[PDB]
């Protein structure tokens, strides 16, 4: 930073050292869209993947094939500014090279010969600007990233249980990116059910039947086997001793002449070990023991061939007798228990009404498509298309990754479709969970929740549109000539353009950009929401989703969320957080080996993070060296624990990582309550830019980075020297340091000046540099709106006193000094846009004309020939902006009017006055007019003067660029020409265009001169055609809506001064409305005569528990003094001795035990320059949670000259008597919010009414009426106020006779008019009559 | 939680303590916001019945 950023750095005041700087703030947008547009990546996402999914498009005839080669994006037809002007989406044309291929030759296997290939136009796709925003139909929009549970597999349970609640049920769910959900769940009887597409429960085994698994196969899949043997006409069991655990012997367990367990003995671990030691693998069992069991396979009598028992049949004495009789020597049965090996599937087969694959497919089809019976082919096809065809079902790469990790697959790569093994494995895991082996998992964890940024959503809609386009293609292949088809004939791009335009225009996640101040937009781009398509509806949204989860640490800001309904649903990315390729939010940590903290940083996902023990960033270090504490505070799992240095795997980077960019900007945040901090965070977004804006005297150190990352401020690309500085532009000559520019030199930065934002605030940039100034890379050139010398300025630094004042600060209200208005503090510039249209009517054309019926020259004075108010004129409410006449619907006047007109002889006119007028409560100076007239319409002076002006401006825009380019390249070719062929007094004579003819001795330098000579002509020719392009759009185009002859836009600028009813607030959550503006002499003042700016009530502090505002005030008092002290030094006998004092002082805040950073010395001239800028207002940096601490503030107060408490004797301006106690007074940083009385105050007597309801309606000049609702009616009823209520219900609303009579009676002075039934009641009656019910008003 | 917050707003508290708080704060604001909606409903029921 040049001159040390003019050296206003002040002091960091916190000893935590940040190993990494904050990542690009907008990166979540910029990188996502960069990834979406791509450049034929052949990598995941970015329209490439969409093309890959949609193509090749198959024949449906065994011959056609439409395949995709590659796509390209052209250049935008119109520049952003133009797009904003003409209401056109800023976008680039999309083309795709496609080859229609005949599919193989007849009887010749594959590879046909003829292919028709062409590049088809798919329409335009919107481009993201530099700052991460889009321009859609003229208006800036941001696409908010979306948080969601996403695709994968989930295993959960129900905390509610049965109605009785005495139960537990487990479930599993597979969510894909595209296609039907698959659910599994237990019922209270432990039966297992499946849901397809969230439809009604079917017994689960059906799907296995649908797979092609027989009953036998299912049983084999789900049961370990107990094998029995028949021999010696006795029964034996192949013994696995483990299986006996926890049981009591129901028979003598014996082998080899030894009884291991007597009947009736409980089987012990020792018994099992004894059996295992002696290798006992076969024991005799009674028939009753086997009769309990379930057979695992069908058995036939292998002599007769007849079935004895089927798989899953429960055995019995009869079945056992038959099996023995048939000569079978082995019987396979299921191993089950009531704990960890439950059968469940066996009973599920029983409740399953299906018996084979076909019946399963038929049942599934019936469930999906009721009211018809399916063919085999239809059912098979439907089932195949449910989960086993990627055109209808896709998990996606991320979904497959999550699924595979959950099911313990070795790889995360895999197919989009499900396999039978996937489903089987999910069922097996669920059954395991029910059995108690392993457990469920939680879904709200940020490992199971991921973000869909702009790119993913855009690609989603692109993919949809592409699929529709494919539908259109597939249709087109069959119709028409099948022999003669180009890709151009085959492809209609309308569906894709429709899908994209729909996404960018009408989507919920596509939002009107917020630009109130730089922080507003910066925060808006880092927004995350759980709402939108594929998300919560707010009925879905309960406590669980809105809660702050522990895994939000370092990822999602726990502080910054909306107040009210959207709470917990809308959030903000943490400062250091990044979203990975899979879509998971990652946070950085420093690797710690031994006790040594490396400077290497690993970005970890929440699941990744859960493995290690992570120490806090504030933990002490002896430097490197090693960790300096014997016991460290660390994080691992949910739990937070104290840990030895050896056990520390990682460590936090900064305190800042927890909080959002907005939350960061709150000083002494550690002293402020979270609820109020929330309000401060949210309210900083609402701060209005002020003309005189200054950086806060108490900053957090983030205020520069915010101004940098939001593109409002202008910075230097490379080192260089400033050639020119203007209100309009800044010319910078590069190569001053390291001589980076080559092959031509210099760069010109045009500045935005008095532009109008979405919310009507003025966006303008002001130059912060001076001609010939040395700037480095990244140095501030121009300040944007609400920024001071590259620092964020959302408000002003005012001198505040905390004390009650005559009840004027009652209940959060605020009192201010007239001096603030005097010095134009908290004055805000605003530009409003008004618009009028003249259209073709059936009654004749509307015309924009200076000629308007019955108007004096006084009213028409500020209008030009056309009828449009001239630039610079002052307009006030009621004044005409654009004159317009409309054809009268026409009617003969009443005879009295006939007479009146005749008496005054005015003669009526065919036309009626429709001119656009300035609304009430508005006014200002006309700073712009824009006029668009239908193409080839009769154009007058209106569309000629402005045009000619634009031609002059464009031509001057070429002369200045060619001036800078000439004096930018020739000043480089001169230093090259001199070297070798020195011609000082000779070269500065001949014309500049002759310097090219002069050659130079054979050398590599000549090549340099030649290259500069080619680049001159090239660039120049590009700026010439650049002027041409401007001389085209001005004299053609605009493309207006049908019926509209002409549109006029008038930009009026208004300056609003702070007044009673306006809302002010600080960063700590202290907000209030101005209640009183009292003259300076009434203001409480310091002994030396200085009056305070603001009086805040102290009663707002204790209940709210936001301490920080006080500390900010104290430090602000200190700062108020030190700069003032410097000012005094500046006033008289200014010498470097003062610099000795200043360096002493900053290095004194540093001299105080802990020092964040040190800075001293430097050039005397630089010290002098820096001295004035820092002297006027001292600055301060107090970082979040590593801040300025009381003792240090006391020290500054000492250099300040104290009082240490921060309280001073204050005199009452009305009396002169001192307030009876010492009162704290300090500089607080306060912002003026977007809520202003001017905007909100409105009133109506009578006005426009609605067509159908006849209720009072808000017109364009008539304000409309307030809603008197049910509760207000209750209020009037409880007061027993019958006539007031009746007035509300009749005369004051929908009764035409009642309101006309009331008005007439009032202007004549009268009592309430007769009521009439409210017109909406007559409407109700008539509507009930149309329903065919007889409704009859009746007499007594 | 086993460990309390030793700090007091005058002193200021470690980042972990604050984070572990945000939850309570959020639950509070959400509570009040829902509360207006529910209270309104009760009021309407009582009005309709009386």
């Amino acid at each position: 930073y040049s001159y040390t950023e003019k050296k206003r750095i002040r002091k960091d005041f916190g000893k935590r050292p940040q190993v990494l700087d904050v990542p690009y703030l907008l990166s979540i947008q910029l990188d996502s869209f960069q990834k979406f547009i791509e450049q034929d990546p052949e990598g995941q996402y970015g329209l490439e993947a969409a093309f890959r999914s949609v193509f090749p498009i198959q024949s449906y005839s065994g011959n056609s094939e439409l395949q995709y080669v590659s796509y390209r994006l052209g250049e935008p037809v119109f520049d952003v500014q133009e797009c904003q002007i003409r209401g056109v989406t800023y976008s680039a044309p999309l083309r795709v090279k496609l080859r229609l291929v005949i599919y193989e030759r007849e009887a010749p296997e594959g590879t046909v010969k003829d292919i028709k290939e062409q590049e088809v136009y798919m329409g335009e796709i919107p481009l993201m600007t530099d700052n991460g925003t889009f321009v859609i139909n003229g208006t800036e929009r941001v696409i908010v990233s979306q948080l969601h549970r996403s695709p994968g597999v989930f295993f959960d349970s129900d905390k509610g249980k049965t109605h009785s609640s005495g139960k537990v049920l487990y479930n599993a769910r597979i969510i894909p990116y595209r296609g039907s959900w698959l659910d599994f769940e237990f019922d209270p009887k432990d039966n297992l059910f499946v849901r397809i597409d969230r439809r009604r429960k079917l017994p689960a085994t059906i799907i296995l039947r649908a797979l092609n698994y027989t009953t036998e196969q299912i049983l084999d899949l789900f049961f370990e086997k107990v094998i029995f043997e028949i021999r010696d006409n006795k029964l034996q069991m192949e013994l696995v001793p483990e299986r006996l655990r926890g049981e009591t012997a129901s028979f003598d367990i014996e082998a080899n002449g030894k009884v291991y367990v007597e009947k009736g003995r409980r089987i012990t671990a020792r018994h099992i070990r004894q059996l295992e030691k002696d290798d006992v693998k076969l024991i005799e069992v009674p028939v009753e023991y086997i009769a309990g069991k379930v057979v695992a396979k069908d058995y036939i009598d292998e002599s007769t061939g007849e079935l004895i028992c089927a798989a899953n049949m429960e055995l019995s004495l009869d079945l056992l007798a038959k099996l023995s009789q048939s000569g079978h020597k082995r019987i396979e049965t299921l191993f089950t228990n009531d704990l960890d090996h439950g059968p469940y599937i066996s009973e599920t087969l029983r409740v399953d009404p299906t018996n084979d694959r076909l019946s399963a497919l038929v049942e599934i089809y019936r469930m999906m498509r009721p009211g018809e019976p399916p063919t085999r082919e239809a059912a098979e096809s439907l089932f195949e298309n449910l989960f086993f065809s990627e055109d209808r079902y896709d998990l996606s790469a991320v979904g497959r990754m999550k699924f595979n990790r959950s099911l313990l697959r070795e790889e995360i790569e895999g197919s989009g479709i499900l396999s039978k093994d996937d489903i089987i494995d999910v069922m097996k895991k669920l059954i395991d969970i029910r059995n108690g082996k392993g457990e469920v998992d939680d879904i709200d964890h940020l490992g199971n929740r991921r973000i869909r940024s702009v790119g993913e959503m855009a690609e989603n809609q692109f993919r949809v549109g592409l699929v529709r386009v494919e539908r259109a293609v597939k249709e087109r292949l069959s119709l028409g000539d099948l022999d003669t088809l180009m890709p151009q004939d085959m492809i209609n791009a309308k569906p894709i353009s429709a899908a994209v335009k729909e996404f960018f225009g009408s989507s919920q996640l596509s939002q009107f950009m917020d630009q109130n101040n730089p922080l507003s937009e910066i925060t808006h781009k880092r927004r995350i929401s759980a709402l939108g398509p594929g998300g919560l509806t707010r009925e879905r949204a309960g406590f669980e989703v809105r809660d702050v989860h522990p895994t939000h640490y370092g990822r999602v800001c726990p502080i910054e969320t909306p107040e009210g309904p959207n709470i917990g649903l809308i959030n903000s990315l943490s400062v250091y957080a990044q979203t990975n390729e899979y879509g998971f939010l990652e946070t950085p940590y420093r690797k710690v080996t031994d006790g040594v903290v490396t400077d290497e940083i690993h970005y970890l996902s929440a699941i990744e993070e859960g493995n290690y023990v992570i120490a806090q960033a504030n933990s002490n270090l002896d430097e490197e060296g090693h960790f300096v504490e014997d016991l460290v505070t660390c994080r691992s799992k949910g739990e937070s624990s104290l840990f030895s240095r050896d056990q520390v795997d990682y460590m936090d980077v900064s305190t800042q990582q927890v909080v959002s960019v907005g939350a960061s900007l709150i000083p002494f945040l550690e002293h402020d309550d979270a609820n109020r901090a929330l309000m401060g965070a949210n309210m900083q977004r609402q701060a209005v830019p002020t003309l005189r804006a200054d950086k806060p005297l108490v900053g957090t150190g983030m205020e520069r980075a915010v101004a940098v990352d939001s593109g409002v401020t202008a910075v230097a690309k490379r080192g260089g020297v400033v050639q020119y500085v203007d209100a309009s532009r800044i010319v910078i000559k590069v190569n001053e340091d390291e001589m980076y520019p080559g092959e031509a030199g210099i760069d010109i930065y045009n500045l935005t000046k008095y532009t109008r934002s979405n919310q009507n605030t003025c966006i303008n940039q002001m130059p912060c540099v001076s001609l010939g100034e040395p700037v480095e890379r990244g140095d501030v050139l121009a300040d944007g709106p609400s920024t001071d010398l590259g620092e964020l300025a959302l408000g002003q630094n005012m001198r505040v006193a905390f004390m009650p004042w005559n009840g004027y600060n009652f209940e959060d209200s605020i009192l201010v000094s007239e001096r603030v208005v005097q010095e134009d503090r908290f004055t805000t510039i605003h530009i409003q846009e008004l618009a009028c249209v003249s259209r073709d009517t059936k009654l004749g054309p509307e015309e924009i004309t200076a000629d308007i019926p019955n108007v004096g020259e006084a009213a028409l004075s500020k209008l030009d020939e056309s009828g449009i108010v001239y630039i610079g004129a002052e307009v006030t409410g009621g004044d005409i902006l654009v004159g317009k006449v409309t054809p009268k619907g026409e009617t003969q006047l009443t005879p009295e009017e006939k007479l009146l007109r005749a008496i005054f002889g005015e003669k009526a006119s065919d036309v009626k006055d429709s001119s656009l007028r300035v609304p009430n409560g508005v006014s200002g100076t006309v700073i712009d007019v824009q006029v668009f007239t239908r193409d080839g319409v009769e154009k007058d002076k209106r569309a000629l003067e402005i045009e000619e002006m634009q031609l002059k401006q464009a031509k001057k825009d070429l002369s200045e660029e060619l001036q800078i380019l000439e004096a930018g390249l020739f000043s480089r070719i001169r230093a090259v020409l001199v070297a070798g062929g020195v011609e000082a007094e000779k070269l500065d004579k001949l014309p500049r265009d002759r310097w090219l003819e002069l050659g130079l001795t054979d050398e590599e330098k000549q090549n340099q001169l030649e290259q500069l000579a080619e680049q001159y002509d090239e660039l120049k020719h590009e700026f010439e055609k650049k002027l041409e392009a401007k001389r085209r759009k001005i004299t053609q185009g605009d493309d207006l809506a049908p019926g509209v002859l002409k549109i006029v836009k008038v930009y009026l600028a208004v300056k609003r001064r702070i007044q009673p009813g306006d809302k002010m607030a600080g960063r700590h959550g202290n907000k209030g409305v101005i209640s009183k503006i009292n003259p300076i002499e009434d203001m409480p003042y310091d002994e030396n005569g200085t009056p305070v700016d603001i009086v805040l009530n102290p009663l707002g502090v204790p209940s709210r528990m936001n301490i920080g505002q006080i500390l900010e005030t104290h430090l602000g008092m200190a700062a108020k003094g030190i700069g003032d002290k410097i000012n005094a030094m500046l006033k008289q006998q200014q010498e470097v001795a003062k610099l000795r004092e200043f360096i002493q002082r900053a290095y004194d805040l540093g001299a105080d035990v802990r020092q964040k950073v040190d800075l001293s010395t430097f050039s005397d001239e630089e010290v002098m320059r820096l001295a004035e800028n820092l002297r006027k207002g001292m600055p301060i940096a107090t970082p979040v949670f590593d801040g300025a601490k009381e003792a240090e503030i006391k020290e500054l107060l000492k250099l300040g000259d104290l009082p240490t408490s921060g309280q001073i004797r204050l005199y009452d301006g009305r009396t002169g008597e001192q307030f009876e106690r010492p009162v704290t007074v300090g500089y607080m940083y306060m912002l003026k919010l977007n809520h202003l009385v001017d905007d909100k105050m409105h009133a109506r007597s009578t006005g426009s009414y609605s067509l159908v309801t006849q209720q009072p309606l808000g017109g364009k000049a008539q304000f409309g009426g307030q809603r008197f609702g049910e509760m207000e009616v209750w209020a009037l009823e409880a007061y027993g106020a019958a006539y007031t209520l009746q007035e509300m219900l009749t005369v004051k609303s929908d009764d035409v006779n009642g309101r006309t009579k009331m008005y007439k009676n009032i202007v004549d002075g009268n009592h309430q008019m007769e009521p009439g039934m409210p017109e909406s009641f007559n409407v109700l009656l008539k509507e009930i009559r149309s329903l065919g019910i007889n409704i009859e008003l009746e007499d007594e | 939680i086993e460990t309390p917050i030793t700090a007091n707003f005058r002193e200021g508290l470690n980042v972990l303590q604050y984070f572990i708080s945000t939850h309570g704060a959020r639950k509070g604001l959400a509570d009040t916001a829902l509360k207006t909606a529910n209270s309104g409903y009760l009021t309407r029921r009582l009005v309709d019945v009386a």
Binding site: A674, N675, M1105 | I5, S21, H23, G24, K27, G28, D31
Partner: peptide
Amino acid sequence: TXXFXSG
């Protein structure tokens, strides 16, 4: 902590 065991 304050309200809601927060505060």
